């Protein structure tokens, strides 16, 4: 059993990489429209993200159950909300991979412009998605080794900037675009939050993957908090640094700023390097997120709250069938990248699948208090405070999202409810049943 567990370093890198992989290189561009004031947005986001990570860290220390959020929700609310949580999170997991692989293969267009052709891109994306499904089939040790390397590669430009970029940084440049939002301070900070709050999706990674982690009660907490802090530092330092090195006007326009900035400062080779590292960190995360999909689905299927096949494992314990299913699904959704008007269509689904993740977060936050009140001791005020901050993070993320996306999330909840009712009636155990027919 322990022969197939993953150690602390890969898990931590899986969390940090699951978090940063997709957008760490695109953040300074996004925040360029608001300006330097974004640092206020970072400060607020990071405090809330620590809060959420501490919640997950403590919750997994008290219950290192596989499936993470799925397990915590089922524990304190029962089978229905477990079922719901897993559906939402699983969908979130594999639906979000489509964006990632497009971005990742996208970064590789630097070398092979052919990858800009929607057809070639789509096929390439499919192949890559399947590569990282097979690597998951080989086992979590494999996938976490690969993603560890990828994540480390992705950290080279980011840290290079965040350590040495400050020797070209200039505060005049940063403050020259302190607030280009045209809004007041709150509005600008808010507009920043609309970007920065989603930056830390994946905080729950090690918790969800607890069932393949070595000494989880020890390691999952450390990996959780550990990954989140790396993400935070890298985010603030990289975006702050770049905002003081490149003019706001240019920074806004670039579709690959570290890359645009790189290719034009230290030569073509520099740009090449940055593109490679970006693609590495991006495509590396496919593995982590695919892993998480498999895990949550398996954990739910083990309790009979998700189809049996997601529980069918090899001798190593890998849910191979589930992984292959997620592969087919991702393949089907990847077809949206074959045309400009085809990607426009899929977008809402992607953005909705992102809001899904927050229900698990919310239930995790609830679960810590509802399940672990007896372990707080008289540090209880602290726990309550941190958890309340965590709640605020979740709620505020949604408050600032698009009405349509959230609406469809709301619809999804109802649909999941009806699904559970129609699929699990007369299997489901009622808290307060009626008397015998």
DSSP 415: H
Does 379 contact a copy of itself by CB under 8 A?
A: no
Tokens representing 300 are: 């739910």
Measured at the alpha carbon of residue 129, what is the angle toward residues 280 and 116, in degrees to the nearest 5? Answer: 70
Does 171 contact a copy of itself by CB under 8 A?
A: no
Does 70 contact ligand N=C(N)NCCCCN by CB under 6 A?
A: no
Q: Using CB under 6 A, pick the residue from 17, 35, 66, 96 that binds ligand N=C(N)NCCCCN.
A: 96
First-to-final CA distance of the chain: 46
* Region class of 68: left (phi > 0), else alpha (psi between -120 and 50), else beta: left
Point out which residues pair with 6 in neighbouring strands. 213
Residue 100 binding partner per list a copy of itself, ligand N=C(N)NCCCCN, none, with a CB distance cut-off of 5 to 8 Å that depends on partner kind: ligand N=C(N)NCCCCN
Where is 216: in which H helix or E strand?
Answer: helix 216-245
Does 334 contact a copy of itself by CB under 8 A?
A: no
Does 195 contact ligand N=C(N)NCCCCN by CB under 6 A?
A: no
Point out which residues pair with 213 in neighbouring strands. 6
Does 411 contact a copy of itself by CB under 8 A?
A: yes
> Is residue 425 part of an annotated ligand binding site?
no
Tokens representing 68 are: 């993470």
Tokens representing 392 are: 């605020």
Length of the chain: 437
Q: Using CB under 8 A, pick the residue from 171, 340, 374, 381 that binds a copy of itself.
A: 374
Give the separation between CA 249 and CA 353, rounded to whole angstroms: 32
Does 422 contact a copy of itself by CB under 8 A?
A: yes
Nearer of residues 326 and 369 to ligand N=C(N)NCCCCN, judged by Cβ: 326
Give the separation between CA 236 and CA 158, rounded to whole angstroms: 10
Instruction: Quote helix, strand, coil % in the chain, to nearest 5.
Output: 80, 0, 20
CA distances from 396 to 196, 203, 362, 392 (A): 12, 17, 12, 6
Give the separation between CA 173 and CA 248, rounded to whole angstroms: 8
Give the separation between CA 406 and CA 413, rounded to whole angstroms: 11
Taking CB under 6 A as the binding criterion, the range among 19-27, 118-126, 329-337, 382-390 that sits at the site for ligand N=C(N)NCCCCN is: 19-27
Does 105 contact ligand N=C(N)NCCCCN by CB under 6 A?
A: no
Give the separation between CA 288 and CA 362, rounded to whole angstroms: 22
Nearer of residues 11 and 93 to ligand N=C(N)NCCCCN, judged by Cβ: 93
Where is 122: in which H helix or E strand?
Answer: helix 118-138
Q: Minimal distance in Å, beta carbon 392 to a copy of itself?
A: 8
Residue 394 binding partner per list a copy of itself, ligand N=C(N)NCCCCN, none, with a CB distance cut-off of 5 to 8 Å that depends on partner kind: a copy of itself
Give the separation between CA 33 and CA 31, rounded to whole angstroms: 5
Give the separation between CA 428 and CA 431, rounded to whole angstroms: 10
Does 346 contact ligand N=C(N)NCCCCN by CB under 6 A?
A: no
Does 417 contact a copy of itself by CB under 8 A?
A: yes
Tokens representing 60 are: 């997994």
> Is residue 125 part of an annotated ligand binding site?
no
Chain positions 44 to 63 lying near a copy of itself, rule: CB under 8 A, are: 62-63
Residue 218 binding partner per list ligand N=C(N)NCCCCN, a copy of itself, none, with a CB distance cut-off of 5 to 8 Å that depends on partner kind: none
Does 10 contact ligand N=C(N)NCCCCN by CB under 6 A?
A: no
Nearer of residues 106 and 271 to ligand N=C(N)NCCCCN, judged by Cβ: 106
Taking CB under 8 A as the binding criterion, the range among 33-41, 208-216, 312-320, 401-409 that sits at the site for a copy of itself is: 401-409
For 32, residues 6+ apart whose C-beta sits below 8 A from its C-beta are 177, 180, 243, 248, 251, 252
Nearer of residues 180 and 233 to ligand N=C(N)NCCCCN, judged by Cβ: 233
Query: 10 Å Cβ neighbour count for 350?
Result: 18
Q: Residue of minimal CB distance from ligand N=C(N)NCCCCN?
A: 96
Q: Using CB under 6 A, pick the residue from 38, 100, 210, 223 that binds ligand N=C(N)NCCCCN.
A: 100
Tokens representing 12 are: 């931590």
Does 314 contact a copy of itself by CB under 8 A?
A: no
- Please give the annotated binding residues for L-arginine, written as ranges: 19, 22-23, 92-93, 97, 198, 201, 289, 353
Residues that bind ligand N=C(N)NCCCCN (CB under 6 A): 19, 21-23, 92-93, 96-97, 100, 199, 201-202, 289
**Interface with a copy of itself (CB under 8 A):** 62-63, 74-81, 358, 362-363, 365-366, 369-375, 384, 387-388, 391, 394-395, 398-399, 401-404, 406-407, 409-411, 413-415, 417-418, 420-422, 424-426, 428, 430-434, 436-437
């Amino acid at each position: 059993a322990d022969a197939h567990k993953v150690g602390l370093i890969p898990v931590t890198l899986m969390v940090s990489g699951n978090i940063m992989g997709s957008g760490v290189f695109l953040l300074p561009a996004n925040l360029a429209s608001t300006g330097g004031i974004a640092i206020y947005g970072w400060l607020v986001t990071i405090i809330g993200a620590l809060g959420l990570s501490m919640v997950y860290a403590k919750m997994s220390f008290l219950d290192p159950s596989p499936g993470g959020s799925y397990a915590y929700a089922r524990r304190c609310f029962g089978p229905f909300l477990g079922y719901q949580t897993n559906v939402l999170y699983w969908l979130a997991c594999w639906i979000g991979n489509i964006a990632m692989v497009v971005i990742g293969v996208g970064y590789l267009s630097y070398f092979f412009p052919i990858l800009k052709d929607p057809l070639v891109l789509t096929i390439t994306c499919v192949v890559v998605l399947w590569i990282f499904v097979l690597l998951n089939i080989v086992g979590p040790k494999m996938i976490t080794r690969v993603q560890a390397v990828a994540t480390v590669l992705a950290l080279i430009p980011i840290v290079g900037i965040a350590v040495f970029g400050w020797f070209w940084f200039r505060g005049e440049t940063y403050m020259a675009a302190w607030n280009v939002s045209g809004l007041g301070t709150f509005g600008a900070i808010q507009s920043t939050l609309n970007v920065t709050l989603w930056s830390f999706i994946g905080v729950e990674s090690a918790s969800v993957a607890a069932g393949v982690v070595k000494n989880p009660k020890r390691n999952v907490p450390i990996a959780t908090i550990g990954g989140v802090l790396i993400a935070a530092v890298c985010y603030v330092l990289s975006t702050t640094a770049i905002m003081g090195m490149i003019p706001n006007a240019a920074l806004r326009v670039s579709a690959s700023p570290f890359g645009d900035a790189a290719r034009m400062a230290l030569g073509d080779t520099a740009g090449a390097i940055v593109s490679f590292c970006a693609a590495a960190g991006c495509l590396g995360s496919l593995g982590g997120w695919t892993l998480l999909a498999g895990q949550t689905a398996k954990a739910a299927a083990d309790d009979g709250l998700f189809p049996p096949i997601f529980a069918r494992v090899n001798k190593a314990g890998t849910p191979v069938a589930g992984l292959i299913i997620v592969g087919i699904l991702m393949t089907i959704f990847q077809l949206s990248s074959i045309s400009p008007n085809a990607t426009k269509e899929f977008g809402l689904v992607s953005s909705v699948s992102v809001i899904f993740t927050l229900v698990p977060y919310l239930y995790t936050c609830a679960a810590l208090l509802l399940l672990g009140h007896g372990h707080f001791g008289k540090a209880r005020p602290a726990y309550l405070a941190v958890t309340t901050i965590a709640f605020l993070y979740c709620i505020w993320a949604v408050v600032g999202s698009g009405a349509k996306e959230v609406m469809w999330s709301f619809v999804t909840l109802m649909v999941i409810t009806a699904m559970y009712a129609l699929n699990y009636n007369r299997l489901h155990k009622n808290p307060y049943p009626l008397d015998a027919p």
